[PDB]
Design an enzyme around this catalytic site. Structure first.
Site, PDB file in Angstrom:
ATOM      1  N   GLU C  46      11.591  -7.671  11.530  1.00  0.00           N
ATOM      2  CA  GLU C  46      11.170  -8.576  10.041  1.00  0.00           C
ATOM      3  C   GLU C  46      12.115  -9.843  10.220  1.00  0.00           C
ATOM      4  O   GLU C  46      13.109  -9.488  10.297  1.00  0.00           O
ATOM      5  CB  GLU C  46      11.006  -7.758   9.019  1.00  0.00           C
ATOM      6  N   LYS C 126       2.963 -10.217   5.254  1.00  0.00           N
ATOM      7  CA  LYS C 126       3.674  -9.381   4.063  1.00  0.00           C
ATOM      8  C   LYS C 126       2.747  -9.252   2.983  1.00  0.00           C
ATOM      9  O   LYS C 126       2.853  -9.796   2.185  1.00  0.00           O
ATOM     10  CB  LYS C 126       4.871  -9.396   4.076  1.00  0.00           C
ATOM     11  N   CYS C 171       8.288  -4.175   6.833  1.00  0.00           N
ATOM     12  CA  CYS C 171       9.198  -3.782   5.711  1.00  0.00           C
ATOM     13  C   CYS C 171       8.611  -2.823   4.750  1.00  0.00           C
ATOM     14  O   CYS C 171       8.163  -1.800   5.000  1.00  0.00           O
ATOM     15  CB  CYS C 171      10.274  -4.710   5.122  1.00  0.00           C
TER      16      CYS C 171
END
EC number: 3.5.1.77
Lengths: 303, 303, 303, 303
Positions: C46, C126, C171
């Protein structure tokens, strides 16, 4: 550089009628696949040339003898050594050994280390034989290793294999801290071997669901406490109506499992190995010269 | 009946200024709660009467001595023994021992076994002292056990404690297969002790995230390989700006963790213990008399 | 054949002053190493082109903007795409994205899938942003992701990448069963992404020693319950005085961890992937059409 | 005080001919022992009053009906409720429910929550029925829950049980993240239930050695993701020639297993439970109100 790529060549079942020639074809395929993935050494299983014959009670000695090797390599296994030398990949091969010495037919559960030049650089004979010696009726299948083999007579040696210090263990040996420790004290950087571990234990069936747990626990603890990379190659799956545990693996000096098989068939796994990583343990928390107190371990060596 | 209930009394941090009287109040509370939950024995941490002083570099001997016990039990600790006898619950207590021999001071990292009658029935002195010997400026906290303690001189004994064979280990000792094996050979059914394990290690910080893993791996393997129940009582939490590992535990002879703490404060955990469970391992897969080959373990005892 | 070799390219720390050009050199080396080991796809971390800037509070917008990409690929990152196409290895790359739409400067924590021809075949932004929005004094280091990014606006898509159905997570997303399930329902065979996970959690420090545990638990459960292979590539080690969790990994549809990193530096791990293995779960124990009861899951989708 | 002691009453095998009276004697014994160890609630297995009959193919309806309860509690089960009220210990009991509506028989795999006053305060009916629908000759034992039970019609409710919010799951349900999530959204502090899980699965035998792994993985992930304490009570051992998985457990909201059984017989395990511990997850990393994005989870609820 002290760097290399280690591989494990897990074997699916080997049938009673499956020939050594057919088995070698399978071993060759995995050795070739491992080389294609950059491996410089591949670990094969315990008694990797035949079905696990100790599960049966034999009455005919000629029949029992057929499962043993009288030469290594013989014409049938020779191709594996040639390919290893060609591709620059050494290996650890397990087999049943028969040798006549002083009028005695000696039988050993054996493993050999072959370097990337195709040369045999070391041998080990199983010291901790599991199972029993006499036929036991209460068992669904036998485990007559004590009857078909005698304890190894080479101790737990560590050999130089292409600049790596390697020690060998065979199956049940992996559960004994003494085996790992002797090789650790001899400076082993990689401790490897193969296994045939049924998922059913007649004497104590209440441990059946712990089979994978006990196998992996033994590998992780051994590696961690000796600061050694390790690898276990199993012959797995349903072989002659007996399920054998899978989960072949490669472990780091920290005890971390870095590679694990997920099938119960012929399968190759690999992992990058840094021989200097052993120092993170052996020069610190497990710096033997600085922390071990042998004067208090005497009972371990008492006969 | 070969049955009992084992408990672990995990301690949260003990401040530099926290008095032994205050600590005893905390120990009494846990011993009483364990008894209320049916426990017949409770394991307390290593150096359970003070803060972990080996994290500092001392320049004054009088100051260092203040963290040691010159008698056991002294007037302040006596109440713990009295309550143990009252409720019928023995315990394993760790403390710093100071002995004067002909005007010479002997220092040990010690642990004792007290039975349900409140009688001291066994002692052990830490043999594997971890850490370094000299002051190392770069470290946020030191670890000078090698300077403040002498290696134990009692070996790894096993004692009879209310019909249970018990062996003691202290902190770092749990990482050495030799310690476990000696007590296993002496017939230990329960192997227990305490610990102060920082979750940060200055020389090898790349292993910080493995602190719990290495701790539990050591307890599981030790128990399994020796067919012994085990328990580890930690002093945990942020003590004097140093984070100590939690995860106090109780483990079966199969290596299975049967009880585990989840807080970083004073906490009691318990587990039913069947002393005959040890046989599942010691009369079978790890039947020493039948399987061990000590003639090949000699190197382990070589000085 | 539906077979392939998946790789993970773990990154060691990226310094505040380390340039994108220097970072690309590192990414190129790992992509090349993976290809040499037979990999056809490699997963990167990431925000893999810069240091984890959300740890700081910015007052100058120009300075904040410097950590974002306005093009993909730009001239500096272009070499990675060219090498990927040359060697036939696709990749998953994470980066900070800045795009101006309708008078608004939109900031996303983004990841893209590039196939073995060097073509971008999918993007994800995300959705689960961890941390906080305002500077919080009690924290030793900040985690301002909610301030520097807005929730993704692409949902949880699954794309066709060289005959494999792949879904992306970034993540914190890996900890939410909803993210995994949406992609599982869309038929994902491989679910992958990267992460920057500090081993210290200011809000709840009592969970610090569980960092590896929580990370691996999330990956294993996600894979198992959706019958999907998965991989997590972390940027790890001590980056700008903040320790980031290692343990990058590859997981099988059974939840078994088949590959794991052991260093806190740039490291490549690989594993053979059989896309049909997904069937062992998705056609049996987790055969959605045969076992799921959506009429009882409504609350999960309520706003 | 938000504090309590939770217990799990694992059951060893229940024979086809073993009467409900004999089973109640066993349940009473465990409930009494749990109370003696301080427990305030005890979790019992799925279908805890009979042998696991779904392993057979029935051809006689009268025979099938005999394994169901037409009232709860009937005269034979009443004693368990009376003792629960006497000692102040509630319980979760699983059983087969037979209801007659207008002459039509309704069949459910059910579980109820009884408080410390012996009052039934909640019911749940298994929603995810595992196994197959038709007779399959090749299997050593069948798994016909889909034929003998209707999917539950009560959804996944959460009830107030002596100041604790409790949700119920039954066997296979624990493998579905949706079940856990619905109860998590309803505020469950404890999610518990029982199970009958064979260690052998005919259609996918290659997963047999992972039985414990998959069971525990499901419990750990569910607890962690929802910040809930959990407990799973299994009926274990060799029941009518079918080996059932042991490893009954209690888990913290962090996913940590705090108690685990090690035998395959009737066994009681306990653990201290702090209901406020759930906040470590639910007010932080898994603070739903702050982090969840339901607008993107729609597919999960689509019929």
């Amino acid at each position: 550089t002290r760097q290399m790529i280690l591989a494990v060549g897990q074997q699916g079942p080997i049938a009673r009628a499956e020939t050594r020639e057919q088995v070698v074809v399978r071993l060759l395929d995995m050795l070739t696949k491992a080389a294609s993935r950059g491996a410089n050494f591949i670990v094969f299983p315990e008694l990797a040339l035949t079905t696990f014959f100790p599960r049966w009670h034999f009455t005919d000695e000629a029949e029992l003898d057929s499962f043993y090797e009288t030469e290594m390599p013989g014409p049938v296994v020779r191709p594996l050594f040639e390919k290893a030398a060609e591709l620059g990949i050494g290996f650890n091969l397990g087999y049943a050994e028969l040798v006549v010495e002083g009028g005695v037919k000696r039988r050993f559960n054996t493993s050999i280390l072959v370097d990337k030049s195709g040369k045999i650089v070391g041998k080990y004979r199983k010291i901790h034989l599991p199972g029993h010696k006499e036929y036991e009726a209460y068992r669904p299948f036998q485990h007559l290793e004590k009857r078909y083999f005698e304890p190894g007579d080479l101790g737990f040696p560590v050999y130089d294999v292409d600049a790596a210090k390697m020690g060998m263990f065979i199956c049940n040996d992996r559960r004994w801290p003494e085996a790992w420790r002797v090789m650790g004290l001899r400076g082993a950087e990689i401790i490897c071997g193969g296994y045939n571990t049924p998922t059913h234990n007649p004497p104590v069936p209440q441990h059946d669901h712990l089979t994978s747990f006990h196998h992996l626990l033994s590998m992780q603890a051994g590696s961690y406490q000796n600061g050694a990379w390790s690898a276990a190659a199993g012959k797995v799956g349903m072989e002659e109506n007996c399920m054998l545990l899978g989960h072949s693996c490669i472990v780091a000096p920290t005890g971390e499992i870095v590679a694990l098989t997920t099938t119960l068939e012929d399968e190759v796994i690999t992992a990058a190995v840094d021989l200097d990583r052993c120092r993170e343990l052996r020069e610190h928390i497990f710096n033997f010269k600085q922390h071990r107190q042998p004067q208090h371990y005497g009972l371990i060596a008492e006969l």
